[PDB]
Amino acid sequence: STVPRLHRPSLQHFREQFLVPGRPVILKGVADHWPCMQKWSLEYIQEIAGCRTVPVEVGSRDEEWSQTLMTVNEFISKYIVNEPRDVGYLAQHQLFDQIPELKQDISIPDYCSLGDGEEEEITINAWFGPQGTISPLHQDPQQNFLVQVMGRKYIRLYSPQESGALYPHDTHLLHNTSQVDVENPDLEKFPKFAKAPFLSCILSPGEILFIPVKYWHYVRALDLSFSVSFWWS
Ligand SMILES: O=C(O)c1cc(C(=O)O)c(NCc2ccccc2C2CC2)cn1
Ligand SMILES: [Mn+2]
């Protein structure tokens, strides 16, 4: 079944029915009027950040992801517009600490204040990449508000209760990552994955997905996509 969509729910309503229990939800009417929703085009991102060095993750379309450095202009040029030869992702980067002028175009969701951490310790990451970027099925150690700004993203969510049916890697460095290709699972090797229930959604611009702490999430970009994630506790 699908992730429920709620429009500007109260802090208490979000705290009691989702944050505390750990239930995913899509929040509407919250970030749809953030400045990023009208300003951030490729033309705008180049003007404000084109000459800045950003980390980019590259990988083949069972291959393997390496990490390099290049200017935003370079990234867009040879991973977004010019019929890219490989997949490049400006992923998990604190672009807004590097570029404060872009931090004016977003805010911190008020729902974060319901956490036991400090606002200064919230990690804001930019996920800027082309159609086709795919995360592995994985779980993070903090709460997360995934704000979609450009394009859409298909996202699958498995509860932490389903960890057994997701076959996590046994190396400590990857114990938070699933061995299973979500959208083409090897059921002969990972049979328990087939009967694991899940939530799914297509996250579209203006929307915020609340990924509870340690909720397994799988993300695939359907179009040219720019997402901003808020990791908070
Ligand atoms: O908000 C979140 O928790 C979140 C969002 C995304 C996203 O792609 O939007 C995400 N993808 C990870 C991913 C994809 C493609 C190559 C590499 C990587 C890894 C970072 C090394 C993971 N986590
Ligand atoms: Mn994640």
What is the SS3 string spanning the chain?
CECCEEECCCHHHHHHHHHCCCCCEEEECCCCCCCHHHHCCHHHHHHHHCCCEEEEEEECCCCCCEEEEEEHHHHHHHHHHCCCCCEEEEEEECHHHHCHHHHCCCCCCHHHHHCCCCHHHCEEEEEEECCCCECCCECCCCEEEEEEEECCEEEEEECHHHHHHHCECCCHHHCCEECCCCCCCCCCCCHHHCCCCCEEEEECCCCEEEECCCCEEEEEECCCEEEEEEEEC
> 90 CA to middle of ligand 1, Å?
10
**Alpha carbons 69 and 57: distance in angstroms, whole number:** 9
User: Mutation test of ligand 1: which of 58, 219, 227, 233 has the most ligand atoms closer than 8 Å to its C-beta?
Assistant: 219
- Ligand 1 pocket, Cβ-based, cut-off 6 angstroms: 57, 65, 89, 91-92, 127, 133-135, 140, 144, 146, 211, 217, 219, 227, 229
> 142 CA to middle of ligand 2, Å?
9
Closest C-alpha residue for ligand 1 atom 23: 135
Q: How many domains are contained in the chain? A: 1
Count, residues in the chain = 233
**Alpha carbons 38 and 50: distance in angstroms, whole number:** 19
**Alpha carbons 120 and 232: distance in angstroms, whole number:** 10
**Alpha carbons 127 and 89: distance in angstroms, whole number:** 7
85: left (phi over 0), alpha (psi -120 to 50) or beta: alpha
Q: Which of 4, 56, 61 is nearest to 27 (CA)?
A: 4
Going by their DSSP bridges, the two strands 87-93 and 66-71 should be labelled as unpaired
123-136 CB burial, b ≥16 within 10 A, e <16: ebbbbbbbeebbbb
Q: Contact at 8 Å (CB) between 215 and 143?
A: no
> 174 CA to middle of ligand 2, Å?
13
> 160 CA to middle of ligand 2, Å?
14
Q: Using CB atoms within 10 A of its CB, is residue 233 exposed (0-12), middle (13-18) or buried (19+)?
A: middle
Closest C-alpha residue for ligand 1 atom 14: 135
Q: Contact at 8 Å (CB) between 196 and 185?
A: no
For 181, phi then psi, to 5°, come to -75, 105
Closest C-alpha residue for ligand 1 atom 2: 229
**Alpha carbons 61 and 77: distance in angstroms, whole number:** 19
**Alpha carbons 101 and 97: distance in angstroms, whole number:** 9
Give the domain extent around 118: 1-233
Sign of dihedral through CA atoms 176, 127, 143, 222?
negative
Atom of ligand 1 nearest to the CA of 229: 1
Q: Which of 163, 170, 171 is nearest to 138 (CA)?
A: 163
**Alpha carbons 206 and 33: distance in angstroms, whole number:** 7
Neighbours of 185 (CB within 10 A): 19
